[PDB]
Design a protein around this ligand. Sequence first.
Ligand SMILES: C[N+]1(C)[C@@H]2C[C@@H](OC(=O)C(O)(c3cccs3)c3cccs3)C[C@H]1[C@@H]1O[C@@H]12
Length: 391
Amino acid sequence: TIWQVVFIAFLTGFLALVTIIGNILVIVAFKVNKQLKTVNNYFLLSLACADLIIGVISMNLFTTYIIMNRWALGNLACDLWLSIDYVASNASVMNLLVISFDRYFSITRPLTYRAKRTTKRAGVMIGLAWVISFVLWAPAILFWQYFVGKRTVPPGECFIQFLSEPTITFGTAIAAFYMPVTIMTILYWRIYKETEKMNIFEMLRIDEGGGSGGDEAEKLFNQDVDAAVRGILRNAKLKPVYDSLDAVRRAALINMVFQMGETGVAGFTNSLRMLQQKRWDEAAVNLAKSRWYNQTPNRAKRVITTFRTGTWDAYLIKEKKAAQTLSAILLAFIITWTPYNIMVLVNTFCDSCIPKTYWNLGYWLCYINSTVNPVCYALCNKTFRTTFKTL
Ligand SMILES: C[N+]1(C)[C@@H]2C[C@@H](OC(=O)C(O)(c3cccs3)c3cccs3)C[C@H]1[C@@H]1O[C@@H]12
């Protein structure tokens, strides 16, 4: 009847406006606060921009197609709606690829990449995704009818003419969804696996606020760490403590020797004793009452935390969060787009087997991805939370 039609129009109109105010909030929070305009978050802006176009155009023009069961906007409006709903949506998956390649390189190649992540290169990548998404889709959706010599799409319906054949449709699905998904899947489990992945050389890097040095500076950094270890083994006061310490805590001791020298650390007689006796809690409290904790409270708090827990938990906070954000993003994308692309896979090997009802549901399911991504920002990043509160 029409009782369900009104109910459908209400729900579709709900998620549409939630998408708009959910993404226009991210854009405003990006414009005002200049502290959220980083490299990774600059890519999230492209997602918000794309999802905004979806929430205000795509999700509203596809609602009408279900209610009226016909397309009453014209042939020009049909081809433009499809161009909009595809170019912006294809750029939305290119961003996820860039975001995934942005994090994987920061983990696999930390020496010659992290120091190259500028706002310029991050602004160019976004431009290339919007342009390439336009070139691959817009001339195909708009101009294909003229190349053929007629319009296949009958009056009262709306679909892409060059994707009329399920075989062509399937191949597009592989290159535009199945391939990007498998790539991001491989990357994610290499980023999540290589989280710790945490040696002394990068431990000092974080504490110094240090940066990636040249190839020669890494050989010099090794020669300095090895010498720092040898100096500890020579030190009659440090050697019995170092030998009793485990690999993670050994590095923390080397952190102090790098900073204060062998003799400097040797003065921590009571704390070094508590370390060898493995009284971590008491050693943490004692080390937190020295000059060292007041001269450099940040570097000390992490080294002391390392002593207390025996883990790298004080040097992985931001990188773990980076993966948890990407996790929520890829999970929201691979769950809302998979059913449609599965149906593209199925429809390739049979005729009348997938009802138009499921095609509309599978199509609308991809739309809610534009609604979840803004929530994923405030569900992980605590900086997006405070910004939305100010707005
Ligand atoms: C619901 N959508 C509006 C449509 C179908 C979905 O997208 C996808 O499943 C597909 O892999 C394909 C659909 C059909 C043949 S290949 C992509 C299309 C464009 C970029 S990736 C998600 C979005 C996107 O705009 C399309």
